[PDB]
Write a protein that binds this ligand. Sequence first.
Ligand SMILES: N=C(N)c1cc2cccc(-c3cccc(N)n3)c2s1
Ligand SMILES: N=C(N)c1cc2cccc(-c3cccc(N)n3)c2s1
Ligand SMILES: [Cl-]
Ligand SMILES: [Cl-]
Ligand SMILES: [Mg+2]
Ligand SMILES: [Mg+2]
Ligand SMILES: [Mg+2]
Ligand SMILES: [Mg+2]
Lengths: 12, 12, 228, 228
Amino acid sequence: KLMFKTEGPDSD
Amino acid sequence: KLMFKTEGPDSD
Amino acid sequence: GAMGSMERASLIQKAKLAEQAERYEDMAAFMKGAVEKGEELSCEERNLLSVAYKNVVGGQRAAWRVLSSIEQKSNEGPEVREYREKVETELQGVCDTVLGLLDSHLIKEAGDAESRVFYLKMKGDYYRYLAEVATDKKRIIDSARSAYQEAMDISKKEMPPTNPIRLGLALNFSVFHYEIANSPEEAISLAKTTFDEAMADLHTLSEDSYKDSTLIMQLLRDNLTLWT
Amino acid sequence: GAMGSMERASLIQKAKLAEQAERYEDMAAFMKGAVEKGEELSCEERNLLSVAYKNVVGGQRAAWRVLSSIEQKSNEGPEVREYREKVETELQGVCDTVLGLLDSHLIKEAGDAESRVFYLKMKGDYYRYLAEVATDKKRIIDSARSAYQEAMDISKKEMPPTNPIRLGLALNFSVFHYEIANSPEEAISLAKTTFDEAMADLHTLSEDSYKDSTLIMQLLRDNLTLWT
Ligand SMILES: N=C(N)c1cc2cccc(-c3cccc(N)n3)c2s1
Ligand SMILES: N=C(N)c1cc2cccc(-c3cccc(N)n3)c2s1
Ligand SMILES: [Cl-]
Ligand SMILES: [Cl-]
Ligand SMILES: [Mg+2]
Ligand SMILES: [Mg+2]
Ligand SMILES: [Mg+2]
Ligand SMILES: [Mg+2]
């Protein structure tokens, strides 16, 4: 999936 | 440490 | 509690070492143990808690998406569904663990805006991760919305528009709107208003605070670029 | 055995899914369950086993080195040592698990060169990872040497010099010599002879086999560049 920006570590 | 090349996934 | 016999300070120290070693499951277990000592968390300790579980749940979310995509193709043996369910259940367990710490008793003892907004944002985030795999789907979404909304209300009253907690909350609530609530127009409006009101407050900030705020503002811009 | 109730074929299928999801702890547990069904492993299944545990132990080795480096600086509270010990013990547990599968009973049922050399190489590798953290240190090193040497002897008699198993074995035994046995001249000699004898056999190979062999030959060259 296209994942949008969320706060903190982009661990996914 | 300098890790030399070993076989397979360089998982470290 | 496996960590009941370890000193609070030792748990925090080991959480920091685990972070350095990229051992995020350990990091999260150490911070869970620290929370369960019953004392309130400092700013640094709250961020250790969040970073640890964000990394743990992030690996689970990424794995779940791979498996869900394979499962969907295979529906265009039970093993794919079974293993997607296995990972999904582990993911839901981690979210339930974090929500349990917030409910017992981090949120109810958090009176300062910076701590209460931080924890309510986390509560929205982990309900959102539950929502991503839900198929009570509506009640989970409304639990996320409710937590985010309470955090927003406090942040607007008690924090300046450049506050990084407030900015990260608005970012995440925007994505909730876009992706979970099927409200893309709300998501875009929130992201734009958040960005512009922070922009107009940057003049009040030190160089270090400026860097912290503009970092998150860039994430709002990144999303807006994909959304409009 | 947690996996005792799952079909062998289902375990293999789920190991492949876990790999796709980068869930290497799951992948290793599935392949352990497959081994414990008691049947010999195919070439593909052997490689699934190796990849899974290599990724698991790799994360542990990397974490151990971070912690050991911090511990050494701090000796230029007990927490750093305690947590380095925790990770070290988990690492030794994974190595003991792999060695246990090889001893019960993968090696003794492996009669073909490609399987027997593969398993003896793994036995050397996991004794080598135990050696990296050992401070029985000598007996562990000699167990690694013995396994590697038996694999070398078989590979030289039964496999061509371009065989990728033989090449990966020689690569790893070279690093054992350099780093573990404190025999850098042996390491360099083995790497050079292995590379040159493979080079002279490449003319016999298909395009696909050529690519497999030259990939590992490049690793020998990379090491030789740092060593000479
Ligand atoms: N990933 C981590 N370990 C951290 C993340 C954050 C985020 C914000 C503030 C702090 C912090 C606050 C007070 C003192 C201190 N040293 N850090 C930390 S620490
Ligand atoms: N990382 C993985 N899943 C794999 C690694 C290797 C290495 C060598 C040979 C095979 C293999 C052998 C027969 C059939 C097949 N499909 N693959 C695989 S598979
Ligand atoms: Cl499963
Ligand atoms: Cl520990
Ligand atoms: Mg389910
Ligand atoms: Mg519109
Ligand atoms: Mg020890
Ligand atoms: Mg010399």
